[PDB]
Amino acid sequence: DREKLLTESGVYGTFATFQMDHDWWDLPGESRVISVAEVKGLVEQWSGKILVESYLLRGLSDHADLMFRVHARTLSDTQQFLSAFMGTRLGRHLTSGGLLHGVSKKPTYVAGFPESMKTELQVNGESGSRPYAIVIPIKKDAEWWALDQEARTALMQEHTQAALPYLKTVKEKLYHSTGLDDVDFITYFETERLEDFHNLVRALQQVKEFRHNRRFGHPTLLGTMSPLDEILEKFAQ
Amino acid sequence: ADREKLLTESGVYGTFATFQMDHDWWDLPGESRVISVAEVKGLVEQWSGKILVESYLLRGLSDHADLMFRVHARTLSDTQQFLSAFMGTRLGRHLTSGGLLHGVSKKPTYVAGFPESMKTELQVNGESGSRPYAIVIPIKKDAEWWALDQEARTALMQEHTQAALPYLKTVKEKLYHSTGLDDVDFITYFETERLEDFHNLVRALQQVKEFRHNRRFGHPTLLGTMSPLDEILEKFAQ
Amino acid sequence: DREKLLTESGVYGTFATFQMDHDWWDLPGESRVISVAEVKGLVEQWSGKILVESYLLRGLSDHADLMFRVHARTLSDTQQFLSAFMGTRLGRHLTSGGLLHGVSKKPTYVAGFPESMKTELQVNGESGSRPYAIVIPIKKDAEWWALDQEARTALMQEHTQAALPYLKTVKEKLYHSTGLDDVDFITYFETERLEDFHNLVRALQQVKEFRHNRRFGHPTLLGTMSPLDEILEKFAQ
Amino acid sequence: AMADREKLLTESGVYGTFATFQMDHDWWDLPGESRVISVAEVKGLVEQWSGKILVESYLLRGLSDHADLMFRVHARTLSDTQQFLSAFMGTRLGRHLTSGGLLHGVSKKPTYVAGFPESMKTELQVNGESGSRPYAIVIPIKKDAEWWALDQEARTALMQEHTQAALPYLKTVKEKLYHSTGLDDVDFITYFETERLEDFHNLVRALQQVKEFRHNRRFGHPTLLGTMSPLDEILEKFAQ
Amino acid sequence: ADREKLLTESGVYGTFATFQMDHDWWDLPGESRVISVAEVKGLVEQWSGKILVESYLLRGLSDHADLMFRVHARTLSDTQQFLSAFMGTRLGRHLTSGGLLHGVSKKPTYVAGFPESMKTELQVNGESGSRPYAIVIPIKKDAEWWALDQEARTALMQEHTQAALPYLKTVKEKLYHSTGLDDVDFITYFETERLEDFHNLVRALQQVKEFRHNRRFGHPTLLGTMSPLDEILEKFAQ
Numbered sequence A, C: 001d002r003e004k005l006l007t008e009s010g011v012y013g014t015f016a017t018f019q020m021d022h023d024w025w026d027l028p029g030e031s032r033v034i035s036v037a038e039v040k041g042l043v044e045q046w047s048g049k050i051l052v053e054s055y056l057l058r059g060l061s062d063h064a065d066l067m068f069r070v071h072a073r074t075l076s077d078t079q080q081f082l083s084a085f086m087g088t089r090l091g092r093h094l095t096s097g098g099l100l101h102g103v104s105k106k107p108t109y110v111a112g113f114p115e116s117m118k119t120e121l122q123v124n125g126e127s128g129s130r131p132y133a134i135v136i137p138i139k140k141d142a143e144w145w146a147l148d149q150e151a152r153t154a155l156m157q158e159h160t161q162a163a164l165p166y167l168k169t170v171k172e173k174l175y176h177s178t179g180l181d182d183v184d185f186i187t188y189f190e191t192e193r194l195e196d197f198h199n200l201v202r203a204l205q206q207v208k209e210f211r212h213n214r215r216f217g218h219p220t221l222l223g224t225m226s227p228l229d230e231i232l233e234k235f236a237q
Numbered sequence B, E: 001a002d003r004e005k006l007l008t009e010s011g012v013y014g015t016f017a018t019f020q021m022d023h024d025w026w027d028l029p030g031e032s033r034v035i036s037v038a039e040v041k042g043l044v045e046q047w048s049g050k051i052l053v054e055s056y057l058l059r060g061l062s063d064h065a066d067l068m069f070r071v072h073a074r075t076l077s078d079t080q081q082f083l084s085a086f087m088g089t090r091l092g093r094h095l096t097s098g099g100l101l102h103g104v105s106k107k108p109t110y111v112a113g114f115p116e117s118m119k120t121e122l123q124v125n126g127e128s129g130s131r132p133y134a135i136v137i138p139i140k141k142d143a144e145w146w147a148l149d150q151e152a153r154t155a156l157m158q159e160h161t162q163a164a165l166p167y168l169k170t171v172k173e174k175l176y177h178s179t180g181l182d183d184v185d186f187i188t189y190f191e192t193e194r195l196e197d198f199h200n201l202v203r204a205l206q207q208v209k210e211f212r213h214n215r216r217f218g219h220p221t222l223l224g225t226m227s228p229l230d231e232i233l234e235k236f237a238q
Numbered sequence D: 001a002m003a004d005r006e007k008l009l010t011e012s013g014v015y016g017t018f019a020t021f022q023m024d025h026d027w028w029d030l031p032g033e034s035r036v037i038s039v040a041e042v043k044g045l046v047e048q049w050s051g052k053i054l055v056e057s058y059l060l061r062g063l064s065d066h067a068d069l070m071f072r073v074h075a076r077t078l079s080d081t082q083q084f085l086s087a088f089m090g091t092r093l094g095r096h097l098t099s100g101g102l103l104h105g106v107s108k109k110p111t112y113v114a115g116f117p118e119s120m121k122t123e124l125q126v127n128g129e130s131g132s133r134p135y136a137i138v139i140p141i142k143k144d145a146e147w148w149a150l151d152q153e154a155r156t157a158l159m160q161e162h163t164q165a166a167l168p169y170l171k172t173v174k175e176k177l178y179h180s181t182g183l184d185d186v187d188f189i190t191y192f193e194t195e196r197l198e199d200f201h202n203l204v205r206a207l208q209q210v211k212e213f214r215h216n217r218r219f220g221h222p223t224l225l226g227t228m229s230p231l232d233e234i235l236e237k238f239a240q
């Protein structure tokens, strides 16, 4: 279900940050490379049940070195996996930075959009390897929920309208996080171009919706997508 | 037996205690770790007469937390003693206190002024499931809320109830009054096997009028899974 | 005498919280019993100049194990004692949680109350041994100061009216903290019955005043009154 | 031959700095002999800098949360203050000190005082209290945007009310004010000495009631309470 | 040549990275430290040509800070790589990451809609000084600000500029656009030998209308002194 987790609804997504202890460096290189192989194997073990992508936060996001984006069909499996991961010789030297869960749904407001707008939505993004990745949690203010459907739909249309041309160079995904933690949404973006993403976010600061974002970022997680090997290789040499 | 006399009756203080495990715990020999566990298991059975204690694995679902206790007692001192004892153990000595919330269970304030039909559908209380997820959300209401008169508040809670009832099928709930015991008014606690239902349930309640009056909503929002204490500690042995 | 500090005006009061380090447990039972005895002896030295009461916060207040309520006639003496205490082998393993100073005054608004109301104010709370204790620091908003005397008096009269019948099961004391730290008042309560105290606070959430408490708690310190030996005794075993 | 000493505590164009430190716990794991050696290292460093800058010391331990020690440093360049402070943190003692907080502000020509009545200027010439080992208070302050949007005359009038409410406390309270905007996250640094803290409390309550007060977006946070003392008395405590 | 090609041109990512030195570092032998220092020094020489890196002594001027890097690059990856390496070094291992802020340098948005005369006075490139103080102010504007239409924001910036120009006497400036890379919209950077002017400059700008729209202003406000890395690190060897 490689293609079935990154795309389908009813799939729980989790974002897990870690910071590496200093004492980790007090360990011998041979010991750490052993620790590295342990993790690679722990992940392969959980293959089939869950999907796991890794992002390097060291040097781009404050107080964080590593991030996991984990998709699962139940959060219990994700829980177990993370407790196991944090149990490894490597994990034991990790301080948990942060943790956000949200489920993927079919869209609420999209059906009431123009046919032409839904067309431009069918595009699934740009072709790039090892892109930058941004994660922005969001809490909407109470005023927003007090609004009726028709109003929110229209605001979200302006949201869409302003953002669509950035699907040239930006992939996106949206998770509904309400009731699972202190936010309503988790937004995720991949791009090779951060100038575009920057402009993209500015444009959305100018729509009417934005004023309703009681929390915007905090934290704003910037990292770069890479295989877990490349990441761990940095933690051994 | 007495379990339902604590989990259901009013005049019962309830406590929510979070813990995170130190790193230095793993620099210990594995054999030392397993012995420490046995201390804890016995400490609980020792308190098994006076109080009730439930455990939740927060590791991997809640940031800066591995373990959680929900302790029911009819005096907080007994809850205090058990907790300082728990932290005095060799295991406890390697635990940082994450958070701590007290609240007593009371007679409902607004339910009496509801429709008769609404009171009947309330007698049903959630679903029976093993190893369920559990959520705890503390709440501080604003001064605006307290300034209101009963009828106004009662109507708001009635709308709250109305939107929530159809989720009472797949969600257990409990409510504690925390004002004056800590920096919140309410501790809300929920059990469910289905987290989307709980999610949909919360969205639903964001849309009633009460929600604007929730000055603090979560912070923290505690997600965990209910489990026997044994299952948890066993992880700290390997 | 002893009590001449718990009641009179011109008496500075200080509230000091501490959390015990973990490394303390990495110490031998021999060191700790020695360390405890040090503290017990230090306190007994100051027993003439100042008053010191002790509270167990472990298990009731997050990030706190012990609390001192120290009354003195000058903050200097309180300073000396506290700097000494933190200097002890035991103190070396305490993280300073928080610190609040406030002086006791004669009441400002009480004279402008009803004759019947002053009667019920002279009456004490209830006397019980090793009771719960709550400490709530309070910052008033600027609006509150802008109000005129007559206005503030009537508001505090409403406060009093709602609270007087809770003197059945609750002792109280109030300290004026403005300019000594980041709050205006320190409130302190003893009681055997926390359900009452709970109800007491709800009642006051409903008066007009409550809206003016910009800061209410943060932290709300819940503890139980105890002799210091009993408290430290736990930290030796 | 001195003079310059009070020429920093009084003159304008003089940067003033407030530096808090918290001592490590392991510092006490050192032998009493090791610490007193460490003390003198600091004491000499200070005497070395006695020409360039002025330094006062305050014991914050037991009065102010997360802080033991405070320096009030006056200099005519912050670099001299920077160097002295990095050096200070360089001593074996400093090596065991965590930098608590840091506030810079310059002493200026008063802005609003000139637009006061002549009688109000006279009572301002009046001095604080003369005392040894007094308590000392520091309160950083940020004014809200509303305040800056005002025209001068309006502000002058408010500060006149401020001054008027505060004047009778110059009997038992000394004061000094630093302009901190652009050097840190506050606009002003206020500093007070007194032997009587209850008077100071009253002094501050009074000003909570003027109109200016609503414009103080930040008032304290932190509020630093201490006692003024010779540096030796402080260092003597960290070994004995 | 390339020096000015990163400090002036657009499409250039700029990063601001703060570090504090751990205490356990002094328990290290001086021999160990000097070797550690040399490690850092060489790493920088390696990344030269690809990126620019400037250093600031924050020790004694900014709380919970000793050191700051300003890194200019045309990709943030190159900056990340350089920074993870730096924190990996024997010295870096003893550094706590204080903070991190990214922003791109752009061509001006509002300048064209200014008077021809205001554009004249802007071309000035500041004061001539070596080892100046340096100040960093991060900035987030409120929603009200974005809601404004172009013409209005431009007038506010015109008022901003007008009030600020006479401080190009003694102040250099640079501006970074930070939105979407972290929790702020702008990163402002200034150099000066005279801090009293910079202060007056900021007081002055606190009085225009734009200022009310600065929801976060500083927090942190980073004050330091510009210096070559050697002199800074040499402090940590003795």
Ligand code: HEM
Binding pocket: A106, A107, A108, A109, A110, A136, A138, A140, A156, A159, A160, A163, A164, A166, A167, A170, A172, A174, A185, A187, A200, A201, A204
């Ligand atoms: C190419 C970029 C983007 C596109 C095409 C896009 C499009 C959409 C669409 C079509 C929806 C409706 C989904 C639904 O009905 O639930 C939506 C929802 C949402 N978007 Fe985006 N968006 C983009 C960028 C962003 C960014 C940059 C942010 C925030 C930083 C963001 C935040 C949100 C949030 C919070 C919602 C759900 C709000 C609600 O349900 O009330 N989006 N987006």
Ligand code: HEM
Binding pocket: B107, B108, B109, B110, B111, B112, B122, B137, B139, B141, B157, B160, B161, B164, B165, B167, B168, B171, B173, B175, B186, B188, B201, B202, B205
């Ligand atoms: C899912 C099923 C739910 C049901 C059947 C339900 C129903 C009720 C009822 C009947 C009361 C009566 C209180 C009284 O009589 O004093 C109440 C109170 C309350 N409920 Fe719920 N609720 C549900 C979910 C929730 C959720 C999900 C939250 C918060 C996240 C919540 C927050 C509260 C709070 C804070 C109160 C106290 C109200 C006050 O005294 O101001 N409830 N609820």
Ligand code: HEM
Binding pocket: C106, C107, C108, C109, C110, C121, C136, C138, C140, C156, C159, C160, C163, C164, C166, C167, C170, C172, C174, C185, C187, C200, C201, C204
């Ligand atoms: C049995 C309970 C209580 C009684 C009899 C009581 C009564 C009073 C009285 C008579 C005053 C007047 C002081 C004066 O005029 O100078 C006062 C002041 C005050 N009370 Fe209470 N109160 C009670 C509980 C509480 C509680 C539970 C709180 C807060 C959690 C509280 C907060 C305050 C504060 C902040 C003041 C200072 C008022 C001001 O100067 O603005 N009181 N109280």
Ligand code: HEM
Binding pocket: D109, D110, D111, D112, D113, D124, D139, D141, D159, D162, D163, D166, D167, D169, D170, D173, D175, D177, D188, D190, D203, D204, D207
């Ligand atoms: C105790 C006797 C006091 C006196 C005689 C006094 C008087 C004055 C005077 C005459 C000025 C004018 C300076 C100028 O024109 O720039 C001033 C400014 C100022 N004062 Fe005070 N004050 C006193 C206490 C306080 C206290 C206790 C605080 C705050 C806790 C305070 C806060 C300030 C601030 C922040 C300014 C800057 C001017 C402005 O608001 O823009 N003062 N004060």
Ligand code: HEM
Binding pocket: E107, E108, E109, E110, E111, E112, E137, E139, E157, E160, E161, E164, E165, E167, E168, E171, E173, E175, E186, E188, E201, E202, E205
């Ligand atoms: C001292 C000389 C200064 C000059 C000549 C100056 C000039 C300018 C100009 C012309 C712009 C807009 C560029 C454009 O039109 O695209 C700008 C942007 C900005 N400046 Fe300044 N400024 C100065 C100082 C400051 C200071 C001291 C601060 C903050 C403490 C500051 C904060 C900002 C901010 C937040 C922006 C972003 C405006 C936007 O694009 O929305 N400036 N500056």
